[PDB]
Design a protein around this ligand. Structure first.
Ligand SMILES: [Mn+2]
Length: 242
């Protein structure tokens, strides 16, 4: 269709950029397997609170990320983007279970319509949320392995945002008032990361209190993203700009 055909040269240029500037990392390289130990089923010991040494703010933030991450040139991009997201989820899970920093039972227990433009706009904001969250988190982590891991993730999220946001720029050029309306509607309705997670109210409040991510960070990044599209004085969006 017509939008897909408009976007293909932009998808190509961005895929080309993303590949030529790639600096590939592996989840397994950020996991201190030497510290791992058998659980009680295999003759070791089960988890208990004494095994966790990281601040609860840091582990709450990581559990939120993990939950979110677990859930044609364009096809080439979606496949690449998907694999990067997946990579993040593996690294986080493996770090967490090897180090025993959280109760692994909790996170392993099986018992517990958008237009195309609307979708690209949503993803640009959502990746920017990811990038701010992981940047702020990495900056508060003193444990160097984990700090390294989260910093890798943050750098990928910057790249994700750049890619989606560039597609949105081409949408603003091809089909302006549609794109603006989509930005207005997302700006009004976006919530903090993990707002949809059942029973995470306490964890969200804790990561907000630490300044990693909350309503103030969300409000500012929304203003910055609108501004970065050159839309800061656009009449229907000035109410989301600080
Ligand atoms: Mn991402």
């Amino acid at each position: 269709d017509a939008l897909t055909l408009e976007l293909e040269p932009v998808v190509e240029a961005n895929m080309t950029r993303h590949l030529d500037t790639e600096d590939i990392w592996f989840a397994h390289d950020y996991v201190p397997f030497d510290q791992g130990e058998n659980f009680a089923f295999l003759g070791g010991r089960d988890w208990d609170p004494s095994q966790s040494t990281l601040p609860r703010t840091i582990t709450d933030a990581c559990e939120i990320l993990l939950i979110l991450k677990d859930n044609d040139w364009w096809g080439r991009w979606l496949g690449r983007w998907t694999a990067e997201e997946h990579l993040h989820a593996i690294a986080l899970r493996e770090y967490l279970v090897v180090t025993r920093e959280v109760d692994p039972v909790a996170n392993e227990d099986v018992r517990v319509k958008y237009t195309q433009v609307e979708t690209l706009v949503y993803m640009a904001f959502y990746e920017r949320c990811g990038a701010v969250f992981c940047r702020n988190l990495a900056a508060q982590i003193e444990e160097p392995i984990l700090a390294g891991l989260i910093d890798r993730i943050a750098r990928d999220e910057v790249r994700h945002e750049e890619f989606f946001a560039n597609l949105v720029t081409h949408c603003l050029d091809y089909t302006r008032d549609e794109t603006i309306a989509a930005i207005a509607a997302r700006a009004a309705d976006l919530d903090v990361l993990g707002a949809d997670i059942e029973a995470y109210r306490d964890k969200l409040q804790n990561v907000a209190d630490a300044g990693i991510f909350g309503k103030p960070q969300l409000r500012q990044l929304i203003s910055d993203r609108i501004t970065a599209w050159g839309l800061a004085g656009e009449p229907s969006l000035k109410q989301f700009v600080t």
